[PDB]
RNA sequence: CGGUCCGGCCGGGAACUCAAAGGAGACUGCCAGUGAUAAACUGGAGGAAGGUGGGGAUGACGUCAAGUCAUCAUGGCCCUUACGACCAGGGCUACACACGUGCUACAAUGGCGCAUACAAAGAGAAGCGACCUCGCGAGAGCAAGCGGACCUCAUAAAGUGCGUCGUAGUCCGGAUUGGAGUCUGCAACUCGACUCCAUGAAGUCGGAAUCGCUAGUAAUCGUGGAUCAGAAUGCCACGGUG
């Protein structure tokens, strides 16, 4: 193994953080730890909808959860009912008081994690891995971004020998550390083991 | 007086608020000394990054705390009720004390 | 590890954090230097009826979302490879690769 | 070395151990695991069978052992010898 | 009347102000020859005064903070030669030529990973 | 020239030849040269018997060679005929106070013997 | 290297002489960073040298060097199935080089109380033509004029 | 400038070091020659730095069935009143041997004692712990300041001045061993660190071979942090001479 994340290396430039917030050296940790509970929480539960990214930040003794989803109908439901359903236990995990904001993302096939969920998904319910990769692939290029790298690996539906399949298209520098490349993974469950899924997704340069 | 000091760790989030507060605490009382900074703290971390053995991976991080102070020399009656009420930006904390 | 080491380390909070009080009290009564020797004989023999496991000194420290033992940091509170893995996607505030 | 200050160390069982066979008196082995607690002259003249890891070893203790906690006349490792 | 120079070194900043006088060149509440120890010091504080004949022409005022020995005297001689540019203007070509307004730009080089000290590998070996 | 029954040297500095002796080293020899009253700036030679006589009553008060061996021999006889661990590993040969015999422990096992 | 073609480091004279062939040797004497102490050495032992020699430091130094300062040396060519040892005429710079390293190390292979009085010693022979400066020089000179035929 | 308890120390003062934030700046820009009118190179007047200024970060498609099922995740198999647990004690620290990586040395460019000067980076609340008293010391007791450009760790050392030592197993070296101890800790026997007194092994520059380094590098000297109740000759960093 080589590379680096290239959410990690773009951490300071082009990509804000996942959880911003501020503690001294004494509550550093259990701030840690409650973000991750909640992290863990609404992964597991609103995965059925498609979450792509969350906001955890927490002003002034009270949490506030910012929501990055595609299908909110699955995060809803009807008329404020499952959200506050959620604010409320969300409160109950972190033991702080709490807020919960609900964001969009338009085209649903663009972002790093919704093009994964979607490959990973595909994986579980058995289709031909070649045909999710280059369904995906000419997905993100006809919504029009500037490059995409798939790149799925291990146990190939039918094999002992786990070969690693990765295509691209347009450009996407990855050394380039003004880029915009969103990057995410994800593992598909399957009953040949774990067949793991990484996308790359350039949308385009910032200056400065 | 009552000084302020804001630790961040953003220094344009933390420059665009102590930014507003110097401009709602101009607005209401009389002398504000200055956005003065001070050390950066620079907190710093080393990892081996294979999960079974590399020792010549590694690693280094650094936690970059941006430290600025505020001077109020003149607080009226109402400047302590304006910045009680003020509420800060999501990722900045602030000491107030008079002396 | 094993759920039973993670139990186990939960255990030895919840001892220490019970009996913090008649430790510093016997440990006092110990280390003072005006002292009735007796009462420095019963506070010595109390501290061993005192359970092994609340002392502060005995408990291993763990990482917060995995229970591995070796390579914690204090200021995360996690392991060194779930550091690496929550800082490079994000989850940790103002942690960019340290470039100097 | 143990602080002066502190006094010796010898824990509750083995003292009221020692204390009720001199009250006593018999000849039998007082079995015990405690290997580190320091001899006290109530404990001369009697066989304590320290736990060595694997038995219980005894140890018949004079005069000489005053001060020597009772896992020094007891080697948890063997070695014969590598030829 | 004064003139001001900034001198830095590898931890050394120096800071110099230049008068006519008559020969006194005081560094930090005490006298050269309490401060350095080492003729070869003194040189490098005296070097720029050697090159143009102004040895007890001007004397100055100097603190300096940080660094060592040879590196507080090598700030001295940097800001010595940015005051005497400020003073006459015109030894700007001797000074180039001297080579002393050229502020040396070494550092002590970071320790990297890996490595015992900021070059030297340990002992590598076949076996 | 004899001080506590052992010649000591005479060109030699007077701490530095009093060092000479099994029982008194350089601590122990600059408070005898303090409660002496001679400085440490003098040689053996040129010391009269006056000042040798308020040595050997200064030397004579603390314990020294021959005492000494016998606080030594009979303290390593008293472990190895009581038999605890430190007289087990004085009577093997080993080093005592808990260093490690994987390898270096040549101060107590001599030279590298071979297997052959 | 194979790609430079790098030039020479300034090296900054004495406060003593303003000679750089004394910086170069107080350079070259110096072991384990501290230069003072070299310092010491080298000023304490032209000083008691030129208090016997009567002339000047610079002076005696340089000519008791110049009684040292090899003409050719020899390098390895192997080119055979034995070594060639071919002479090559030295560098002016490079000459300087060598007189003050076997100087110095003639100096640490002396038998003398100080350092101060090794480097007198030897240099005062090295005036005198004589010592184990000047048979190392006179030696690896009579090798080179012995292997004259490889001049090839 | 004032007032000086002579100590930036109190009125101050925006000039300076400094602390960040925003910038300007270095790009073959200018010149000459070579060069195919080109790419470019050899130079040099300017400039704080001339050609990538220096250092880091960034490790292409892939190779080695490389490493980890013991961070974690996981297909299958194996265990299920036990291969799962819980507790006490022991072991991971053994030792006729051999290797790797380091540290201390073998001394006079040095050792010892007395004074004297110059840093950088950091870390601190179950914590850092001044000042003052006691102990030769490791430390003890009292205990303000402090979430800290505020106080504490904390004296930097090599260096400088003087004295001494006289090339010796030495006033080198410090191993090992006995006694006496302080701290941490329920607990220092196996098995901690450190202090004092005493003891003072081998070693007098190293065969075959082999390694690191191109400049603030090598070499040498100190200091900190993480881990951490206590436990680094390591690891990660910072400066000093060079
Ligand atoms: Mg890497
Ligand atoms: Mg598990
Ligand atoms: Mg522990
Ligand atoms: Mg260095
Ligand atoms: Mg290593
Ligand atoms: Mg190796
Ligand atoms: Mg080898
Ligand atoms: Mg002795
Ligand atoms: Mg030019
Ligand atoms: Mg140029
Ligand atoms: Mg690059
Ligand atoms: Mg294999
Ligand atoms: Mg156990
Ligand atoms: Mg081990
Ligand atoms: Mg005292
Ligand atoms: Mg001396
Ligand atoms: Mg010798
Ligand atoms: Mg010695
Ligand atoms: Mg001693
Ligand atoms: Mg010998
Ligand atoms: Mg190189
Ligand atoms: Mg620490
Ligand atoms: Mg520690």
Same mark, same amino acid.
């Given at each position: 193994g080589q590379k680096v994340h290239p959410n990690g290396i773009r951490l300071g430039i082009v990509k804000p953080w996942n959880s911003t917030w501020f503690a001294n050296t004494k509550e550093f940790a259990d701030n840690l730890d409650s973000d991750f509970k909640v992290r863990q929480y609404l992964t597991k539960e609103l995965a059925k909808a498609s979450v792509s990214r969350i906001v955890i930040e927490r002003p002034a003794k009270s949490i506030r959860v910012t929501i990055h989803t595609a299908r909110p109908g699955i995060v809803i439901g009807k008329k404020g009912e499952d959200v506050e359903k959620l604010r409320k236990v969300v409160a109950d995990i972190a033991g702080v008081p709490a807020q919960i904001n609900i964001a969009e993302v338009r085209k649903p096939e663009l972002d790093a994690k919704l093009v994964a969920d979607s490959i990973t998904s595909q994986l579980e319910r058995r289709v031909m891995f070649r045909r999710a990769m280059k369904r995906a692939v000419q997905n993100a290029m006809r919504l029009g971004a500037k490059g995409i790298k798939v790149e799925v690996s291990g146990? !190939?539906?039918?094999?002992?020998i786990a070969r690693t399949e990765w295509y691209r298209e347009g450009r996407v520098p990855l050394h380039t550390l003004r880029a915009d490349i969103d990057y995410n993974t994800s593992e598909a469950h399957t009953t040949y083991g774990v067949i793991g899924v990484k996308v790359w997704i350039f949308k385009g340069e910032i200056l400065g | 007086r009552i000084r302020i000091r804001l630790k961040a760790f953003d220094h344009r989030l933390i420059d665009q608020a102590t930014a507003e507060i110097v401009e709602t605490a101009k607005r209401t009382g009389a002398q504000v000394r200055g956005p003065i900074p001070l050390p950066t703290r620079k907190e710093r971390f080393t990892v !081996?990054?294979?999960?079974?053995?590399?020792?010549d991976a590694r690693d280094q991080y650094e936690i970059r705390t941006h430290l600025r102070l505020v001077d109020i020399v003149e607080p009226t009656e109402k400047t302590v009720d304006a910045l009680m009420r003020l509420d800060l930006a999501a990722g900045v904390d602030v000491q107030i004390s008079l002396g | 590890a094993k759920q039973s080491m993670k139990a186990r380390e939960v255990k030895r909070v919840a001892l220490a954090d019970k009996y913090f009080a008649k430790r510093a009290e016997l440990k006092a009564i110990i280390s003072?230097?005006?002292?009735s020797d007796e009462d420095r004989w019963n506070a010595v023999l109390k501290l061993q009826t005192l359970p092994r496991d609340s002392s502060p000194s005995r408990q291993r420290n763990r990482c917060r979302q995995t229970g591995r033992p070796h390579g914690f940091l204090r200021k995360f509170g996690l392991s060194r490879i779930k550091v690496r893995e929550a800082a490079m996607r994000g989850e940790i505030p103002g942690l960019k690769k340290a470039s100097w | 070395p143990r602080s002066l200050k502190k006094g010796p160390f010898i824990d509750l069982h083995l003292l009221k151990k020692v204390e009720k066979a001199v009250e006593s008196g018999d000849k039998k082995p007082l079995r015990t695991?405690?290997?580190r607690s320091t001899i006290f002259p109530n404990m001369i003249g009697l066989t304590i069978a320290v736990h060595n890891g694997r038995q219980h070893v005894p140890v018949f203790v004079t005069?000489?052992?005053?001060?020597?906690? !009772?896992?020094?006349?007891?080697?948890?490792r063997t070695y014969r010898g590598h030829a | 009347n004064q003139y001001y120079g900034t001198g830095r070194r590898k931890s050394s900043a120096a800071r110099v102000f230049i008068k006519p006088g008559n020969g006194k060149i005081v560094i930090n509440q005490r006298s050269l020859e309490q401060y350095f120890g080492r003729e070869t010091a003194r040189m490098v504080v005296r070097q720029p005064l050697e090159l143009v004949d102004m040895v007890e022409k001007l004397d100055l005022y100097i603190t300096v903070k940080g660094g060592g020995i040879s590196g507080q005297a090598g700030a001295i001689r940097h800001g010595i030669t940015r005051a005497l540019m400020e003073y006459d203007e015109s030894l700007r070509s001797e000074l180039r030529k001297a080579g002393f307004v050229t502020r040396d730009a070494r550092q002590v080089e970071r320790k990297k990973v890996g490595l015992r000290k900021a070059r030297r590998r340990p002992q590598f070996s076949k076996r | 020239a004899r001080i506590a029954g052992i010649n000591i040297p005479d060109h030699k500095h007077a701490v530095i030849a009093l060092?000479?002796?099994?029982?008194?080293?350089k601590t122990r020899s600059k408070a005898i040269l303090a409660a002496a009253g001679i400085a440490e700036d003098v040689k053996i030679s040129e010391l009269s018997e006056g000042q040798i006589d308020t040595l050997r009553d200064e030397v004579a008060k603390f314990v020294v060679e021959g005492d000494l061996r016998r606080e030594i021999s009979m303290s390593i006889k008293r472990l190895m005929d009581l038999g605890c661990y430190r007289g087990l590993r004085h009577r093997r040969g080993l080093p005592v106070r808990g260093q490690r015999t994987k390898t270096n422990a040549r101060t107590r096992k001599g030279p590298r013997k071979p297997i052959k | 290297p194979r790609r430079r073609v790098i030039g020479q480091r300034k090296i900054l004279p004495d406060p003593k002489f303003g000679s750089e062939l004394l910086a170069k040797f107080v350079n070259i004497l110096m072991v384990d960073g501290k230069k003072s102490t070299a310092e010491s050495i080298v000023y304490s032992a032209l000083e008691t040298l030129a208090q016997r020699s009567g002339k000047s430091e610079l002076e005696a130094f340089e000519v008791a060097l110049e009684n040292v300062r090899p003409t050719v040396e020899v390098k390895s060519r192997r080119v055979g199935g034995s070594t060639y040892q071919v002479p090559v005429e030295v560098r002016p710079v490079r000459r300087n080089a060598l007189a003050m390293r076997w100087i110095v190390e003639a100096a640490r292979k002396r038998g003398d109380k100080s350092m101060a009085l090794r480097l007198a010693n030897e240099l005062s022979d090295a005036a005198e033509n004589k010592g184990t400066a000047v048979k190392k020089r006179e030696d690896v000179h009579r090798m080179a004029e012995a292997n004259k035929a490889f001049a090839h």
């Open positions: 146990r !190939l539906g039918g094999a002992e | !081996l990054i294979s999960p079974h053995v590399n020792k | 003072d230097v005006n002292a | 695991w405690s290997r005069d000489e052992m005053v001060g020597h906690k !009772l896992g020094e006349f007891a080697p948890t | - | 060092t000479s002796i099994y029982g008194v080293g | -």
